[PDB]
Amino acid sequence: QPQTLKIRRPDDWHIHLRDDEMLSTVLPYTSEVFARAIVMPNLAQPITTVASAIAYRERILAAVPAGHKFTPLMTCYLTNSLDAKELTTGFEQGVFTAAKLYPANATTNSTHGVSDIPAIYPLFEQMQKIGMPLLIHGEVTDAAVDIFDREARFIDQILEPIRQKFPELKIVFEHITTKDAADYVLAGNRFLGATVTPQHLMFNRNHMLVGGIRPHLFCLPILKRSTHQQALRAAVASGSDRFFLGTDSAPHAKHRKESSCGCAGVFNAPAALPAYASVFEELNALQHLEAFCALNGPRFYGLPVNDDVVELVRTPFLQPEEIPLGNESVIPFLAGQTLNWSVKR
Amino acid sequence: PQTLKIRRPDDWHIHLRDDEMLSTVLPYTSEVFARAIVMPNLAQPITTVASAIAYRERILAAVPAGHKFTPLMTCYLTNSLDAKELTTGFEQGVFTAAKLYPANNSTHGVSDIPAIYPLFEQMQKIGMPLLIHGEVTDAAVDIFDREARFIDQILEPIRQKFPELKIVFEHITTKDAADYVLAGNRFLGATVTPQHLMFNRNHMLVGGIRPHLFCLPILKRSTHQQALRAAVASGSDRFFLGTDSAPHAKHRKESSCGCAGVFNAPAALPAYASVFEELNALQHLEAFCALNGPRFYGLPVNDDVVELVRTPFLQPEEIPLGNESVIPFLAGQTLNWSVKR
Ligand SMILES: [Zn+2]
Ligand SMILES: [Zn+2]
Ligand SMILES: [Zn+2]
Ligand SMILES: [Zn+2]
């Protein structure tokens, strides 16, 4: 009988569900396994009001397959013109679980993002006061800064000053990719946490570029050198409660990935939990998987831990090469590869 | 408009491919360049005099009427290559140089480089230049560090043992390489592509991933780009024009695993002119394009002239290739310089 592992039902603290037909297609891969997910607000029209958040939440709930138990945790897209009252009442009414900071032009659907971050300090002050967490895509966008350096520059230039001025603001440093970030979070306090994706644990920039260029490994923040990958792996393997599961599943149609200018984002929802299990196994750290997947996140946000359990079984499972999307398709993470772990039905 | 008359240039590093691709891409080179160093990495690599002669003939047959062009052939070095094949090829005028590709068996590429030291000794003796793709392949080495490791681990020992061997450090991409060449002597030269002068890795990756800027060796950080620019702008005679034009069909570039190589032949000379202009170094363009290479190899300089004219020049979006196409360097963009023949 193959090795099994019982853990509390996990949550995904960072995901893109998109909208319309894409939403219908991709959500089931998440709702099958995860009880809750932090749903990012970067649609074509960003989610900046309570009304638009309620409407999007309804569309997500309508896409949940029968027999799945799933609750989306909505987020507000911060902007330079955002009204603080909208953020405050959204949080107190339970519409917004958190607010998300995109530096302007840092990534997908970020043209309406925040251009001069210190200008919205009055929003952070209000968030600190009410206990609303701030989620951050932590990259500078200055053209003179090399893409591989943008996360590290963010830490010193933007994040540290925020933490000095608002010491009791809950901040999630989303999808960390560097030793710089890992060390900074490890040296922080209970008000600073971080999510880590499976791709930044499993791969480094050599996988994207050696022997050919692989746009399905292209995501933001970009894959870093092996040194940084190893630091992330050691961070989560340490069992520190500052790190938790956030996939940053970010699906795009195949033709938008395999083009002259490929979109950033990996569609990793289909194999997400098994992928993480494989990593924790390689790190001799399966004892810390549960905390990372199911405990650390809820404890950071101040939300309850799930009552359910899931069973991971160490039996092979082949990822499909493509996932249909109308007359187009989406290429999943680890397409055509065999994972060592499966989830028991 | 401003004009610049220079000696007819040569391209000291090019891939012409073969068959229909060869027919399509060669004219872009033969229109402007009198000679080109033709790399030997075909599907069946060029490792014998016979195969080199045959490939040369196919190239010459593809030269359009009214173009004056001569391909300078190269031998693909392998672990099992016979030294006599190299020697007679050089003396018969078939091989102009030999090319070292680090592997990634002995038929197909050099795996243990010190094992072919006896070939280098023979090349040194006869005056045959060694062209090097200078990257290690060790899996522990990050892709952006591979050029720098090559310098210390492979190139320096070769230069210590064979101090009078002519070596071209092909398509340099790093400050490490630039500084090493600048600190060398007349037996060490280097080619520089337009893409490594014009761009850095941010251009390939910021705001989207751009496989038409993906080439080997990979684009480096801006620091290295600036060092290359300063190297050629200094007017050092150790650097010369080598495009490393490396065309692939569009569908092979824009795929789940894109091929390395930029097709820069169509706008090659105008692109370089733009760079030298930005660097306030147009006085050094002629040497880089037409003098430094021939003088390094010990070959004659071209008698012809070409005129560069500062009038706009729109690059096409696509170049036909049978039922397929090839995306050129700077597709859809406007260069400030054009060539009058
Ligand atoms: Zn992000
Ligand atoms: Zn995201
Ligand atoms: Zn090469
Ligand atoms: Zn080449």
XYZ file of C-alpha atoms in Angstrom, chain B residues 77-337:
261
model
C 36.433 20.694 -34.630
C 35.770 17.269 -33.088
C 37.638 14.878 -30.774
C 38.240 12.440 -33.656
C 39.166 15.018 -36.336
C 42.380 14.140 -38.192
C 45.053 16.877 -38.153
C 46.006 16.220 -41.821
C 42.396 17.050 -42.842
C 42.755 20.427 -41.102
C 46.244 21.128 -42.457
C 45.536 20.345 -46.126
C 42.192 22.134 -45.963
C 43.990 25.272 -44.808
C 46.779 24.988 -47.402
C 44.295 24.340 -50.248
C 42.377 27.509 -49.273
C 39.224 25.567 -48.383
C 39.287 26.265 -44.635
C 39.920 29.850 -43.576
C 39.616 28.852 -39.899
C 38.486 26.135 -37.476
C 35.604 26.504 -35.041
C 35.464 25.191 -31.499
C 31.999 24.360 -30.075
C 32.110 22.897 -26.570
C 29.941 19.745 -26.562
C 26.361 20.527 -25.399
C 30.133 11.612 -29.242
C 33.710 12.299 -30.423
C 32.546 12.646 -34.054
C 30.043 15.365 -33.044
C 31.902 18.022 -31.013
C 34.676 18.603 -28.491
C 33.951 17.161 -25.032
C 37.451 17.198 -23.458
C 39.148 20.288 -24.849
C 42.750 19.644 -23.732
C 42.658 16.338 -25.688
C 42.775 18.286 -28.987
C 45.806 20.381 -27.996
C 47.744 18.563 -30.754
C 45.386 20.185 -33.302
C 46.004 23.644 -31.827
C 49.751 23.016 -32.026
C 49.421 22.257 -35.731
C 47.164 25.285 -36.266
C 49.676 27.519 -34.475
C 52.482 26.170 -36.651
C 50.660 26.833 -39.962
C 48.954 30.129 -38.985
C 45.349 28.868 -38.998
C 43.013 30.869 -36.734
C 40.916 29.223 -34.019
C 37.377 30.582 -33.584
C 35.765 29.839 -30.224
C 32.218 29.751 -28.930
C 33.369 30.532 -25.401
C 30.918 29.046 -22.924
C 31.293 26.214 -20.439
C 28.418 23.721 -20.270
C 28.816 22.499 -16.665
C 25.314 22.114 -15.187
C 26.399 23.754 -11.916
C 27.220 27.004 -13.750
C 24.441 29.561 -14.168
C 23.797 30.396 -17.820
C 24.744 34.075 -17.371
C 28.126 33.058 -15.855
C 29.161 30.594 -18.592
C 31.219 33.018 -20.669
C 33.248 34.280 -17.702
C 34.037 30.739 -16.528
C 35.211 29.843 -20.015
C 37.826 32.599 -19.938
C 39.607 31.323 -16.812
C 39.028 27.589 -17.220
C 39.536 27.016 -20.964
C 40.734 30.085 -22.893
C 43.559 31.272 -20.645
C 45.225 27.822 -20.547
C 45.045 27.606 -24.354
C 46.659 31.048 -24.650
C 49.390 30.172 -22.142
C 50.323 26.992 -24.036
C 49.908 28.360 -27.593
C 50.960 32.028 -27.371
C 51.180 32.520 -31.168
C 47.874 30.848 -32.050
C 45.415 33.305 -33.573
C 42.169 33.117 -31.621
C 38.860 34.870 -32.184
C 36.705 35.052 -29.120
C 33.417 34.933 -31.026
C 30.359 37.024 -30.138
C 31.509 38.399 -26.815
C 28.790 39.456 -24.419
C 30.538 40.395 -21.162
C 32.736 43.017 -19.585
C 34.866 40.025 -18.527
C 35.469 39.159 -22.182
C 35.913 42.781 -23.283
C 38.525 43.432 -20.574
C 40.307 40.152 -21.300
C 40.571 40.934 -25.019
C 41.675 44.539 -24.322
C 44.420 43.189 -22.011
C 45.613 40.624 -24.594
C 47.871 40.934 -27.634
C 47.620 40.798 -31.444
C 46.876 37.037 -31.357
C 43.512 37.536 -29.599
C 40.547 39.180 -31.302
C 36.775 39.229 -30.901
C 33.560 39.664 -32.878
C 30.579 41.610 -31.579
C 26.989 41.310 -32.783
C 24.546 44.171 -33.204
C 22.076 42.714 -30.692
C 24.667 42.561 -27.876
C 25.502 46.210 -28.545
C 21.888 47.384 -28.855
C 20.206 45.386 -26.096
C 20.549 43.717 -22.715
C 18.548 40.965 -20.998
C 15.869 43.426 -19.790
C 14.794 43.887 -23.424
C 14.153 40.141 -23.702
C 12.224 39.809 -20.426
C 10.666 43.044 -19.091
C 6.969 43.374 -19.939
C 6.939 40.030 -21.764
C 9.241 37.291 -23.019
C 10.704 37.942 -26.488
C 12.156 34.883 -28.201
C 13.410 36.886 -31.191
C 16.006 38.400 -28.838
C 16.960 34.959 -27.521
C 20.387 33.943 -28.831
C 23.555 32.263 -27.626
C 25.470 33.455 -25.728
C 22.524 34.998 -23.943
C 22.016 38.753 -23.588
C 23.626 39.915 -20.353
C 22.833 42.670 -17.864
C 23.177 46.345 -18.853
C 26.604 46.631 -17.193
C 28.028 44.176 -19.704
C 26.248 45.798 -22.654
C 27.855 49.128 -21.712
C 31.322 47.548 -21.540
C 30.930 46.129 -25.064
C 29.792 49.499 -26.360
C 32.790 51.235 -24.753
C 35.152 48.582 -26.141
C 34.132 49.108 -29.795
C 33.831 52.902 -29.330
C 37.439 53.018 -28.069
C 38.554 52.134 -31.605
C 40.583 49.151 -30.421
C 41.561 47.039 -33.447
C 40.928 43.807 -31.497
C 37.170 43.974 -32.222
C 35.476 43.440 -35.569
C 32.067 42.887 -37.133
C 30.495 39.441 -36.733
C 26.704 39.340 -36.831
C 26.152 35.742 -35.797
C 23.052 35.943 -38.001
C 21.291 32.716 -37.054
C 17.897 32.415 -38.794
C 15.102 30.050 -37.766
C 11.544 29.747 -38.985
C 9.017 31.766 -37.001
C 7.251 28.676 -35.657
C 10.564 27.334 -34.274
C 11.134 30.640 -32.423
C 7.624 31.227 -31.085
C 7.086 27.813 -29.497
C 7.131 26.090 -26.114
C 10.924 25.716 -26.597
C 12.295 28.465 -28.807
C 15.494 28.071 -30.821
C 18.384 30.403 -30.107
C 19.407 32.854 -32.804
C 18.670 36.294 -34.219
C 18.255 36.876 -37.961
C 20.102 40.204 -38.191
C 21.573 40.038 -41.701
C 18.894 42.301 -43.319
C 19.735 45.418 -41.255
C 23.225 44.463 -40.056
C 25.371 47.349 -41.290
C 22.765 50.085 -40.625
C 22.269 48.707 -37.091
C 25.986 48.964 -36.350
C 26.057 52.485 -37.824
C 23.270 53.490 -35.400
C 25.290 52.156 -32.459
C 28.540 53.898 -33.453
C 26.561 57.110 -33.978
C 25.035 56.946 -30.472
C 28.560 56.416 -29.113
C 29.983 59.450 -30.991
C 32.325 56.977 -32.653
C 31.487 56.953 -36.394
C 35.198 57.547 -37.092
C 35.841 53.973 -35.837
C 33.064 52.274 -37.845
C 35.142 51.620 -40.965
C 37.897 49.882 -39.007
C 35.397 47.669 -37.149
C 33.481 46.764 -40.341
C 36.225 46.570 -42.958
C 39.780 46.700 -41.545
C 40.180 45.074 -38.113
C 38.957 41.626 -39.240
C 41.122 41.304 -42.370
C 44.167 42.555 -40.457
C 43.633 40.033 -37.673
C 43.221 37.094 -40.085
C 46.013 38.341 -42.370
C 43.706 38.681 -45.362
C 43.491 41.560 -47.807
C 41.169 44.519 -47.273
C 38.403 45.027 -49.874
C 38.987 47.542 -52.710
C 35.288 48.449 -53.081
C 33.396 51.078 -51.103
C 29.835 51.293 -49.784
C 27.884 54.403 -48.836
C 25.824 54.677 -45.689
C 23.125 57.353 -45.972
C 21.213 58.749 -43.011
C 17.680 58.266 -44.345
C 14.954 56.229 -42.629
C 14.691 52.538 -43.370
C 11.739 50.430 -42.271
C 12.436 46.783 -41.434
C 9.765 44.415 -42.727
C 7.724 42.469 -40.166
C 8.366 39.081 -41.850
C 10.594 37.552 -44.521
C 9.132 34.731 -46.643
C 10.549 31.211 -46.523
C 8.544 28.825 -48.691
C 5.199 28.352 -46.924
C 6.824 29.585 -43.652
C 8.587 32.819 -42.661
C 11.494 34.280 -40.689
C 11.202 37.253 -38.328
C 14.091 39.659 -38.828
C 16.002 41.647 -36.229
C 14.161 44.892 -35.403
C 11.076 43.727 -37.334
C 8.730 46.650 -38.065
C 11.165 49.226 -36.653
C 12.775 52.173 -38.425
C 16.573 52.471 -38.652
C 18.131 55.928 -39.135
C 20.710 54.622 -41.627
